[PDB]
């Protein structure tokens, strides 16, 4: 990355762990997925079609003060160009983001132009009058942009009369060592100690660097994705329980500390296999951490979106399939004839977790998550 | 039916043995094969060998020794608690 590029890369991921952070305190919220780089260019597309105080707190969320507007812009554009490094384009990694304006409302062709190149930003017209035909478009557009693997955003909309920014994601992370195909089966996951859902786990005994936090009570494992471009990480409890304690540990300190303490030793890692579906309305939270401007039907200032003061932000959706599958490079299975995998240590992820991808050239978070609820329909 | 069958030893010399199995019904990721003196104190060697192979040499055995040999069948099922999946055979390698 640039170094404009790279400064944005820290900023998008120090947002994402507040938006987690303020997410994780939430009791309605469960399974958390965020894209750090599709976040910030929801707050940058707010910063190119608005004006004033309006643009002005989207770069504050950001905490990107002292940048230049086509720093900001030039930056995201090429974070979100990125993101297709470590992955196979459209077939691994899709993502689509469209701002759906009321039926009354034409963006300006200045906006249009812009907010394409910069952010590969669609613009569509909505008929807020039918509810069911306003979501039908919006959950037929999120499907089509993932082949199925997000059938549906949202079930409702709340607010049915300003614009609405909708982020449509499907991620499947390759491993750089492949599970067997055939090494999954039924399994429990604990989402408490007294609530258990049936879910489909996939198996493999390999190399990897590990860190077992005695003090911390937690395991953590970096799984390499394809040729090592990115990585996987699970930081996991030794004991089913809510991760608000694991949550207060989530620091760059914190995870720069338990990465140096990682050795490379056998790890027989269960993990769960399907689709797990997380959609998200980021507009509260983002209002809560200082985008109060844009979320205001009268203060919201969008007249470089539109042309007029008729629009305001009602809706950030932020919607992930991201889908854990056996795949991944093929490797020597004479490796499974080693003295090293005498004594594996046990990875078993059957109770909530956190995790979070990184691409490995650039030093971006990709992703970062936590699974605590497993839909419970996806088992074979 | 979900555990090794048919394990055996094909070929016999006083320090080495070369044993044969039949794998499961499930498919078998790797297969851990241990081995040691029948009744005695030494603790057991054991090695690792991929799922793909029928067949395996244990060598640097005592001539005219009995030992126990096992083979664990890992797959989906061993993962998170679930049951081992062995079988065992006892052979007197020659003095010869």
């Keep these: ?380 | 039916s979900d555990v090794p069958r048919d394990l055996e030893v094909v070929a016999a010399t006083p320090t080495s043995l070369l044993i044969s199995w039949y794998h499961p019904e499930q498919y078998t990721e790797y297969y851990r094969i241990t081995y040691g003196e029948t009744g005695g104190n030494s603790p057991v060697q054991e090695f690792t060998v991929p799922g793909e192979r029928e067949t395996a040499t244990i060598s640097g055995l005592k001539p005219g020794v009995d030992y126990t040999i096992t083979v664990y069948a890992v797959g989906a099922e061993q993962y998170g608690g679930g049951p081992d999946a062995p079988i065992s055979i006892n052979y007197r390698t020659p003095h010869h």
């Design chain 1, 1 to 380: 990355l640039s170094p404009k590029a790279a400064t944005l890369a820290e900023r998008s991921a120090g947002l994402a762990f507040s938006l987690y952070q303020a997410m994780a305190k939430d009791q309605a919220v469960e399974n958390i997925l965020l894209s750090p780089v599709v976040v910030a260019s929801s707050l940058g597309l707010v910063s190119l079609g608005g004006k004033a105080t309006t643009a002005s707190q989207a770069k504050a969320v950001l905490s990107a003060e002292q940048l230049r507007d086509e720093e900001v812009h030039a930056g995201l554009g090429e974070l979100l160009r990125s993101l297709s490094n470590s992955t196979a384009r459209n077939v691994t990694w899709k993502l689509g983001s469209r701002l759906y304006g009321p039926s009354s409302v034409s963006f300006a062709e200045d906006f249009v132009r812009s907010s394409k190149q910069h952010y590969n930003c669609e613009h569509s017209k909505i008929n807020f009058r039918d509810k069911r035909s306003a979501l039908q478009s919006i959950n037929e557009w999120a499907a089509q942009t993932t082949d199925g693997k997000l059938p549906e955003v949202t079930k409702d909309v709340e607010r049915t009369d300003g614009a609405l920014l909708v982020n449509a994601m499907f991620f499947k992370p390759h491993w750089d060592e492949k599970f067997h195909h055939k090494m999954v089966d039924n399994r429990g996951f604990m989402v408490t100690r007294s609530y258990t859902v049936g879910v489909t786990m996939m198996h493999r005994t390999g190399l990897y660097n590990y860190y077992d936090d005695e003090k911390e009570k937690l395991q953590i494992v970096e799984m390499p994705l394809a040729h090592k471009l990115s990585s996987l990480i699970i930081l996991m409890p030794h004991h089913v329980e809510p991760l608000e304690r694991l949550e207060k540990l989530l620091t760059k300190e914190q995870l720069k500390i338990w990465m140096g303490k990682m050795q490379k030793k056998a790890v027989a890692i269960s993990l769960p296999k399907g689709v797990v579906e997380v959609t998200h309305d980021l507009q509260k939270h983002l209002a809560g951490l200082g985008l109060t401007e844009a979320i205001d039907k009268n203060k919201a200032d969008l007249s470089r979106m539109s042309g007029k003061k008729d629009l305001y932000l009602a809706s950030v959706f932020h919607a992930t399939a991201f889908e854990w599958d056996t795949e991944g490079n093929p490797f020597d299975q004479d490796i499974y004839g080693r003295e090293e995998l005498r004594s594996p240590k046990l990875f078993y992820a059957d109770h909530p977790f956190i995790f979070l991808v990184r691409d490995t050239q650039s030093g971006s978070l990709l992703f970062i998550g936590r699974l605590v609820r497993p839909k419970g329909d996806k088992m074979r």
